Design an enzyme around this catalytic site. Structure first.
Site, PDB file in Angstrom:
ATOM      1  N   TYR A  75       0.926  -1.136   0.000  1.00  0.00           N
ATOM      2  CA  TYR A  75       0.000   0.000   0.000  1.00  0.00           C
ATOM      3  C   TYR A  75       0.976   1.198   0.000  1.00  0.00           C
ATOM      4  CZ  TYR A  75      -3.351   3.539   1.932  1.00  0.00           C
ATOM      5  OH  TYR A  75      -4.098   4.669   2.157  1.00  0.00           O
ATOM      6  N   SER A 132      -4.227   0.475  -6.189  1.00  0.00           N
ATOM      7  CA  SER A 132      -4.351   1.907  -5.869  1.00  0.00           C
ATOM      8  C   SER A 132      -3.010   2.590  -5.640  1.00  0.00           C
ATOM      9  CB  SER A 132      -5.302   2.102  -4.686  1.00  0.00           C
ATOM     10  OG  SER A 132      -6.474   1.308  -4.759  1.00  0.00           O
ATOM     11  N   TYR A 133      -2.774   3.174  -4.446  1.00  0.00           N
ATOM     12  CA  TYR A 133      -1.459   3.767  -4.144  1.00  0.00           C
ATOM     13  C   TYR A 133      -0.392   2.670  -4.213  1.00  0.00           C
ATOM     14  CZ  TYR A 133       1.702   7.325  -2.231  1.00  0.00           C
ATOM     15  OH  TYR A 133       2.695   8.240  -2.038  1.00  0.00           O
ATOM     16  N   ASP A 160     -13.518   3.123 -13.968  1.00  0.00           N
ATOM     17  CA  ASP A 160     -12.926   3.600 -12.733  1.00  0.00           C
ATOM     18  C   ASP A 160     -13.008   5.142 -12.731  1.00  0.00           C
ATOM     19  OD1 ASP A 160     -11.164   4.312 -10.629  1.00  0.00           O
ATOM     20  OD2 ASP A 160      -9.979   2.489 -10.913  1.00  0.00           O
ATOM     21  N   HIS A 177     -12.996   1.120  -9.606  1.00  0.00           N
ATOM     22  CA  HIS A 177     -11.786   0.987  -8.809  1.00  0.00           C
ATOM     23  C   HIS A 177     -11.762  -0.260  -7.898  1.00  0.00           C
ATOM     24  CE1 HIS A 177      -8.024   2.475  -7.457  1.00  0.00           C
ATOM     25  NE2 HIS A 177      -8.387   2.411  -6.176  1.00  0.00           N
TER      26      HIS A 177
HETATM   27  N1  LIG Z   1      -8.677   8.533  -2.649  1.00  0.00           N
HETATM   28  C1  LIG Z   1      -8.085   8.308  -1.320  1.00  0.00           C
HETATM   29  C2  LIG Z   1      -7.566   6.854  -1.092  1.00  0.00           C
HETATM   30  C3  LIG Z   1      -6.932   6.395  -2.449  1.00  0.00           C
HETATM   31  C4  LIG Z   1      -7.541   5.439  -3.291  1.00  0.00           C
HETATM   32  C5  LIG Z   1      -6.926   5.021  -4.475  1.00  0.00           C
HETATM   33  C6  LIG Z   1      -5.709   5.554  -4.910  1.00  0.00           C
HETATM   34  C7  LIG Z   1      -5.126   6.546  -4.107  1.00  0.00           C
HETATM   35 CL1  LIG Z   1      -3.608   7.316  -4.517  1.00  0.00          CL
HETATM   36  C8  LIG Z   1      -5.717   6.930  -2.912  1.00  0.00           C
HETATM   37  C9  LIG Z   1      -6.478   6.715   0.053  1.00  0.00           C
HETATM   38  C10 LIG Z   1      -6.953   7.104   1.496  1.00  0.00           C
HETATM   39  C11 LIG Z   1      -8.340   6.470   1.879  1.00  0.00           C
HETATM   40  N2  LIG Z   1      -8.983   7.133   3.018  1.00  0.00           N
HETATM   41  C12 LIG Z   1      -9.628   8.450   2.858  1.00  0.00           C
HETATM   42  C13 LIG Z   1     -10.543   8.889   4.029  1.00  0.00           C
HETATM   43  C14 LIG Z   1      -9.801   8.629   5.357  1.00  0.00           C
HETATM   44  C15 LIG Z   1      -9.614   7.102   5.470  1.00  0.00           C
HETATM   45  C16 LIG Z   1      -8.964   6.513   4.234  1.00  0.00           C
HETATM   46  O1  LIG Z   1      -8.418   5.445   4.421  1.00  0.00           O
HETATM   47  C17 LIG Z   1      -9.391   6.264   0.749  1.00  0.00           C
HETATM   48  C18 LIG Z   1      -8.792   5.981  -0.655  1.00  0.00           C
END
Ligand SMILES: NC[C@]1(c2cccc(Cl)c2)CC[C@H](N2CCCCC2=O)CC1
Ligand SMILES: *[C@@H]1O[C@H](CO)[C@@H](O[C@@H]2O[C@H](CO)[C@@H](O[C@H]3O[C@H](CO[C@H]4O[C@H](CO)[C@@H](O)[C@H](O)[C@@H]4O)[C@@H](O)[C@H](O[C@H]4O[C@H](CO)[C@@H](O)[C@H](O)[C@@H]4O)[C@@H]3O)[C@H](O)[C@H]2NC(C)=O)[C@H](O)[C@H]1NC(C)=O
Ligand SMILES: NC[C@]1(c2cccc(Cl)c2)CC[C@H](N2CCCCC2=O)CC1
Ligand SMILES: *[C@@H]1O[C@H](CO)[C@@H](O)[C@H](O)[C@H]1NC(C)=O
Ligand SMILES: *[C@@H]1O[C@H](CO)[C@@H](O)[C@H](O)[C@H]1NC(C)=O
Ligand SMILES: *[C@@H]1O[C@H](CO)[C@@H](O)[C@H](O)[C@H]1NC(C)=O
Ligand SMILES: *[C@@H]1O[C@H](CO)[C@@H](O)[C@H](O)[C@H]1NC(C)=O
Ligand SMILES: *[C@@H]1O[C@H](CO)[C@@H](O)[C@H](O)[C@H]1NC(C)=O
Ligand SMILES: *[C@@H]1O[C@H](CO)[C@@H](O)[C@H](O)[C@H]1NC(C)=O
Ligand SMILES: *[C@@H]1O[C@H](CO)[C@@H](O)[C@H](O)[C@H]1NC(C)=O
Ligand SMILES: *[C@@H]1O[C@H](CO)[C@@H](O)[C@H](O)[C@H]1NC(C)=O
Ligand SMILES: *[C@@H]1O[C@H](CO)[C@@H](O)[C@H](O)[C@H]1NC(C)=O
Ligand SMILES: *[C@@H]1O[C@H](CO)[C@@H](O)[C@H](O)[C@H]1NC(C)=O
Ligand SMILES: *[C@@H]1O[C@H](CO)[C@@H](O)[C@H](O)[C@H]1NC(C)=O
Ligand SMILES: *[C@@H]1O[C@H](CO)[C@@H](O)[C@H](O)[C@H]1NC(C)=O
Lengths: 727, 734
Positions: B509, B592-593, B670, B702
């Site tokens: 992650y 994702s990240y 997505d 997504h």
């Molecule tokens: N869009 C933000 C995020 C993400 C998804 C996909 C790719 C990337 Cl780069 C980031 C990461 C943080 C997450 N989040 C936000 C609210 C507070 C708790 C939490 O865990 C949600 C999903």
């Protein structure tokens, strides 16, 4: 010796030389050699420099193409070439006076020009800019605006819309000069109610938000473009008043419903012929229209109409044939399917409905190539009864029994596939042999059909290929229900019938396709055979062309049936041959062949281990109206909706469990929309079938940029090699 | 030898984790759905009665997705025609059932395609959002009062969030906040007029002839952002003859000078509301404490009650500034704040005073404030055994900060090292939810003396089942880098022999405030790879990870794609040095990240990784949304951080992919990490002539989470990993 490698194919290591000439009279042609244009005398082969390469050394633009005016007075120079669809593009143009040695700097041809053409004689120019027509009488004089209705994606004056470009005229042009340039005829397409295909274009990495490309594209059964036809007299144009375009309306038989303009052929200076096709493409009408010197109008007498219909399929191979008129315009020669369903030359009198067949037999005429005062010259596959071969013939207009094959016996082991280019009045002809041996270009005289000299024999390439282990090509047939069905095989070098090889089936199988022929090719199949020792076969079953209507119309209203079954049967006959490894038979295709590959892989035959579909059609409702409807009719309960639903790749998803599948598609494909492959993958996922995929960002139906072309062929080679256990 | 946990077991949910999801209705009663019946439980004696019979749910024809009983228990809201939109949002149809009259309400019905609906905290008032406007129903049978008239699809949102506030700010579709007793209804209004649209094709069912283009207002880093306004309507003075008066609470001047966000709404009392505002440069935030004025009918946010929160080393909050927990009189509040050492602890504030007092301290962090009473504050922290990846409930005397008691630490220390809590309406009782390392355990407790009442769910059924399965084990430990601890976890195969060299998959992650090394028990894909395929599945928390202090978390501030990427590579180096790892067989994967870090790692040229899988990865930070990206990266401008925006792309690393086997996966619909992101990676790969593997998922978002796509992606990925690791395959009949 070394082999013909993937790198050799991708880097064009072994080049095929050509001899591309442009005729300028009945005795002279132009030839571009070392960037300089030479003028050649056909009888003695002597040359002089026409346009020396250094002329434009200070122009300041790379020149994509050129075009010398018929009278040789001016040269049009093309630059800033920007490709649109298959035939279309826009460009910038510059006009050079070849006598004054001056570039035209006032009243220039605008940037982003859609189409430009000289008059057939002299140096008048006609061009399309911002969907409107403009005419230049003299290259230095201001242009007369012909049309004012031009509107992007809505109104097209003198240019074709997506569907007419692709399926009807195979060209962006919708302009037809009269033989001496007095008149300029043109079509106008109206896409107001045509729905738009929308897809994302990502562009360079710097583009923050993707762009949505929107194109008027009619899918089967949707609202189609409308067409109107006009003729303007370019000799009566005025600087003080707007131009008068006379409209030629379609006949009442066509006006009752949806229809298409399918051919434009000038007969004389004052006689134009048009062919109209109904949306149900088994009925067409030719109007022969005459200019009325006293009224300014164009009269298409009902007594000069010619009807063409088919009871077993559609009209023409892909459209009704073009007529070849006699100089007086009172008679014409045209390829027509006979009573036995073989395409032969018919001779018509403009006022007589019934025509006389001047050729006959269980073979077909491919094209009428030249018509003179005494002879008609044509290409056919008559020789040795080979549908996959091509030869030039000449037939005496006053005695049909007086036929001569002009090419058949020149080099029978090397040349079984010809094309021809005749001089302005057919005194000379260039014969272009393209197989089975290396391409050979020769010059001849029509006086008594004698060879003058060899233009290009590809000796350089032969010297190179002598040190390479080249594959061979077998062209033969199998008998099914007492009917011949031809096939070809690209065989590895040092081929041994006692050894067993993996086999790749290279498929097109579309209506009027021909994948079994005598053409010499240097392609991906050369690499697979030469280096990977893979037999690359191709088969022409029901629905293939050039063998008569009983074979070609067999799939009428039934795409996805016989042509699919016949590819499976072919592979059965191949496997049940002692050099094929039944455990390693693969199938592949692009476009219609992508569709047949997918249908074969979803058939449950158990013949094929693996296969590759590149940009495939998956359902006929997703494809364009003009092509689809020609063979399938309309997707309505009243017409052929049941077979539209029964011939989808998606309906066969469960059967893909039995195979290894590679699905490939370009994301910016304007032709076979990515939608088609997106629907296949979703069907595969829904029944839980595993498969391999690859998308090509911003690539169209060709997947043809230097880097994508290299990647797809590299990726595909790996897939086949792993399927066939090759190291 | 017993059977193993198979991919089929994971995809078909063969071994189910039981839960005990309860809803408190008072300080001594909760509701619980058992055998489809709604049961009402007395917390002290554990006796139950049926509230609503399972059969009542079938006298409607349609299938009920969810339900919600009004606080006073007089009515039941029934959800059906559930249509998912983004991560939190959806639309639905609603029916109200009168529990006293025992009949379905059929007149003045909640409309179809309702965006959001909620009861008042007390009684049975309803507030709902339909066609981007707010409506209030005083009585379920009476016509609704239209509050707003500005609602416009993709343009004006009243009481609902737009794409970016739903995903990144409120983690909800709701932008409605009832006052504690339901007198007032507070709401936000978002304006997306100038936000550019992300456009992508949706193919739908095979019968759709032409694809549809989905267009969504989505601000990418540096683009024009939605604007926000905040309002309060008094629901007790609503009229059938005149339009409703909504009083606006404007943001302070410190926020009005530029682009900003509304980041928190918390009611303090019946007449006092607090709001937190964040600048577009997310290192500065302000809290306004607003009171109702009987003499005007307005809300006065006194300048003297403002509270500023800023960070010199990063952004404010973990993902946003923390929520305040007010005392009953509303004159004081408790809030999680990062201290001078950069550790997140509970600060106690006076509404009129700027300086707060830290009531907790240490090299550990408070995760959340869970309940506040007259004598005690209850919170969750990772203090116990100094484990950042563990969680426990603590209570503290508001009158003596040294008087801390761990309420969960020693209940079952070998089985339970990760807790969450659910307190009764006035904190007389609490449910403890243990979620690892052992099987989940749910227990009920009384707060009067922290007396363990009974076990609600011990997952005995599942334990019986897993006794016949060769289950993998989990190791949670740490490595020392520059005299700093960095924790990792490893899903180890059964009968694990340290003398053999196993293949290793690094599950990534590595996002800011991520935590992939913890004490949670999971049944997932990693369970299959370890159990059946004998693959070690490791995860590492390096620079940028959370819950360990700001020196670790802020280390990647303005520098995404750097330290967190290098730290995953280093982790794998240390793992191949551990002796039981086969250095020739190390893979990396992430969604994702984590897809972004996988791709950056594979393009790093380290030579550590044989292969890897990026699922829906970010490729360039300019393609991702403003709120998330800007929080860590600043603005993509020459003046700010454009140079690092350009230097941290996956595309810039294309040439290095020659050294690895890569599988690139992305869903075509997505809305979050746009397909564009992966379309740009593949084009870069193609341009430098690198071969790779790919898979698109038609109309998947997504999550790639439909039953069939979920099964397909995991099946496809298993095959890729097995071929990379030279593991054999098994034929099937069909
Ligand atoms: N869009 C933000 C995020 C993400 C998804 C996909 C790719 C990337 Cl780069 C980031 C990461 C943080 C997450 N989040 C936000 C609210 C507070 C708790 C939490 O865990 C949600 C999903
Ligand atoms: C390939 O070679 C051919 C043969 O050499 C070229 O054809 C020749 O072209 C020239 C110039 O175009 C012609 O020359 C002159 O023709 C007559 C005289 O004809 C007689 O002499 C010729 C040799 O000089 C013979 O070839 C003829 O058969 C014949 O016996 C002259 O009167 C002309 O003069 C007029 O034009 C010139 C301009 O060049 C003026 O200066 C004069 O004042 C006058 O007005 C020609 O000079 C020649 O006829 C022609 N021969 C044949 C048989 O074709 C051919 O052009 C070349 N092709 C290429 C592409 O290079
Ligand atoms: N669009 C038609 C076609 C095609 C491409 C991709 C998918 C499919 Cl299904 C069909 C096949 C016929 C072709 N054609 C038309 C004019 C006469 C000569 C000729 O060869 C053009 C390309
Ligand atoms: C075409 O574009 C160039 C560059 O903007 C311009 O200088 C030139 O004059 C244009 N040509 C014509 C014919 O307008
Ligand atoms: C084009 O067709 C539309 C209807 O489809 C019609 O309204 C319009 O007038 C037409 N335009 C021209 C230039 O014929
Ligand atoms: C020619 O037609 C256009 C468009 O209808 C008009 O603007 C223009 O003024 C016309 N010119 C003359 C001379 O009629
Ligand atoms: C071209 O043809 C037209 C129409 O028949 C005629 O009026 C004209 O004279 C011809 N021009 C030439 C150059 O022969
Ligand atoms: C043309 O096709 C249509 C549809 O199949 C049919 O009704 C009609 O009879 C056909 N025409 C001929 C002459 O076969
Ligand atoms: C051959 O004849 C049989 C029997 O009529 C039929 O099933 C088959 O489709 C025909 N076609 C070919 C080309 O074999
Ligand atoms: C539980 O039992 C008590 C009697 O001791 C009773 O008064 C109470 O109402 C019961 N509650 C429920 C929910 O069954
Ligand atoms: C909701 O939709 C159903 C089905 O179309 C319809 O019968 C019902 O009346 C609708 N309800 C409201 C409140 O409009
Ligand atoms: C939304 O913002 C635009 C300016 O971007 C403004 O013109 C419009 O009136 C605003 N609407 C509301 C209801 O705030
Ligand atoms: C309420 O506002 C709407 C929209 O501005 C308006 O149409 C309506 O007349 C107003 N209602 C009353 C009762 O004034
Ligand atoms: C609810 O709070 C409001 C505002 O303080 C007050 O006017 C009302 O009387 C309260 N009602 C109850 C039941 O506490
Ligand atoms: C917030 O961030 C900017 C950009 O990094 C920085 O220059 C500024 O000093 C910070 N502001 C505060 C309030 O710490």
């Amino acid at each position: 010796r070394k082999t013909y490698t993937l790198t050799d194919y991708l880097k064009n290591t072994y080049r095929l030389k050509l001899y591309s000439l442009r005729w300028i009279s009945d005795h002279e042609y132009l030839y571009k050699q070392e960037n300089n244009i030479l003028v050649f005398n056909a009888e003695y082969g002597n040359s002089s420099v026409f346009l020396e390469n250094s002329t434009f050394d200070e122009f300041g633009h790379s020149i994509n193409d050129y075009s010398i005016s018929p009278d040789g007075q001016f040269i049009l120079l093309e630059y800033n070439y920007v490709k649109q669809w298959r035939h279309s593009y826009t460009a910038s143009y510059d006009i050079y006076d070849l006598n004054k040695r001056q570039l035209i700097t006032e009243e220039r041809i605008p940037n982003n020009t859609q189409w430009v053409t000289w008059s057939p004689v002299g140096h008048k120019l006609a061009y399309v800019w911002n969907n409107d027509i403009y005419v230049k009488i003299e290259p230095n004089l201001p242009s007369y605006r012909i049309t004012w209705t031009g509107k992007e994606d809505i109104i097209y004056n003198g240019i074709t819309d997506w569907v007419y470009e692709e399926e009807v005229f195979s060209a962006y042009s919708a302009l037809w000069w009269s033989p001496n340039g007095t008149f300029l005829a043109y079509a106008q397409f109206n896409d107001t109610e045509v729905p738009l295909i929308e897809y994302s274009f990502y562009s360079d990495e710097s583009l923050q938000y993707p762009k949505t490309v929107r194109v008027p594209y009619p899918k089967a059964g949707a609202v189609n473009p409308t067409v109107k036809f006009f003729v303007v007299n370019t000799d009566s144009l005025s600087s003080v008043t707007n131009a008068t375009s006379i409209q030629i309306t379609a006949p009442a038989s066509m006006l009752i419903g949806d229809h298409y303009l399918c051919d434009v052929t000038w007969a004389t200076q004052e006689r134009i012929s048009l062919q109209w096709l109904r949306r149900i493409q088994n009925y067409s009408v030719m109007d022969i229209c005459d200019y009325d010197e006293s009224s300014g109008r164009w009269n298409c007498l009902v007594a000069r109409q010619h009807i063409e219909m088919s009871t077993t399929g559609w009209v023409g191979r892909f459209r009704p044939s073009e007529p070849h008129f006699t100089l007086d315009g009172n008679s014409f020669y045209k390829i027509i399917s006979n009573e036995e369903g073989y395409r032969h030359i018919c001779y018509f009198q403009i006022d007589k409905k019934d025509c006389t067949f001047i050729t006959k037999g269980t073979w077909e005429v491919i094209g009428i190539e030249a018509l003179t005062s005494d002879y008609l010259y044509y290409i056919s596959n008559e020789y040795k009864g080979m549908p996959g071969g091509r030869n030039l013939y000449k037939i005496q207009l006053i005695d049909y029994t007086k036929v001569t094959c002009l090419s058949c016996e020149l080099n029978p082991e090397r040349c079984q596939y010809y094309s021809v280019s005749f001089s302005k009045e057919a005194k000379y002809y260039q014969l272009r042999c393209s197989g089975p041996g290396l391409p050979l270009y020769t010059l001849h005289s029509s006086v008594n059909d004698k060879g003058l000299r060899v233009l290009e024999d590809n000796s350089a390439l032969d010297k190179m290929l002598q040190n390479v282990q080249m594959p061979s090509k077998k062209l033969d047939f199998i008998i099914l229900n007492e009917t011949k069905f031809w096939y070809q095989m690209i065989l590895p070098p040092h081929f041994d019938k006692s050894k067993k090889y993996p086999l790749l089936l290279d498929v097109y199988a579309g209506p009027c396709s021909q994948k079994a022929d005598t053409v010499f090719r240097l392609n991906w199949a050369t690499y697979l055979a030469s280096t990977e020792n893979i037999i690359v076969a191709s088969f022409d079953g029901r629905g293939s062309g050039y063998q008569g209507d009983k074979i070609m119309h067999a799939i009428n209203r039934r795409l996805g049936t016989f042509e699919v079954e016949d590819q499976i049967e072919a592979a059965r006959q191949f496997s049940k041959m002692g050099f094929v490894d039944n455990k390693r038979i693969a199938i592949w295709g692009w476009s219609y062949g992508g569709y047949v590959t997918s249908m074969v892989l979803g058939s449950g035959s158990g013949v094929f281990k693996c296969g590759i579909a590149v940009a495939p059609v998956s359902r006929w409702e997703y494809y364009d109206s003009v092509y689809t409807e020609r063979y399938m009719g309309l997707p309505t309960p009243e017409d052929n909706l049941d077979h539209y639903r029964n011939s989808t790749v998606m309906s066969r998803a469960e059967n893909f469990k039995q195979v290894e599948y590679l699905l490939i598609h370009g994301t910016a494909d304007d032709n076979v929309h990515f939608q088609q492959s997106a629907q296949i993958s979703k069907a595969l996922v829904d029944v839980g079938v595993d498969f391999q995929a690859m998308w090509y960002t911003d690539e169209d139906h060709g997947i043809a940029s230097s880097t994508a072309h290299q990647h797809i062929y590299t990726h595909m080679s790996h897939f086949i090699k792993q399927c066939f256990s090759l190291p």
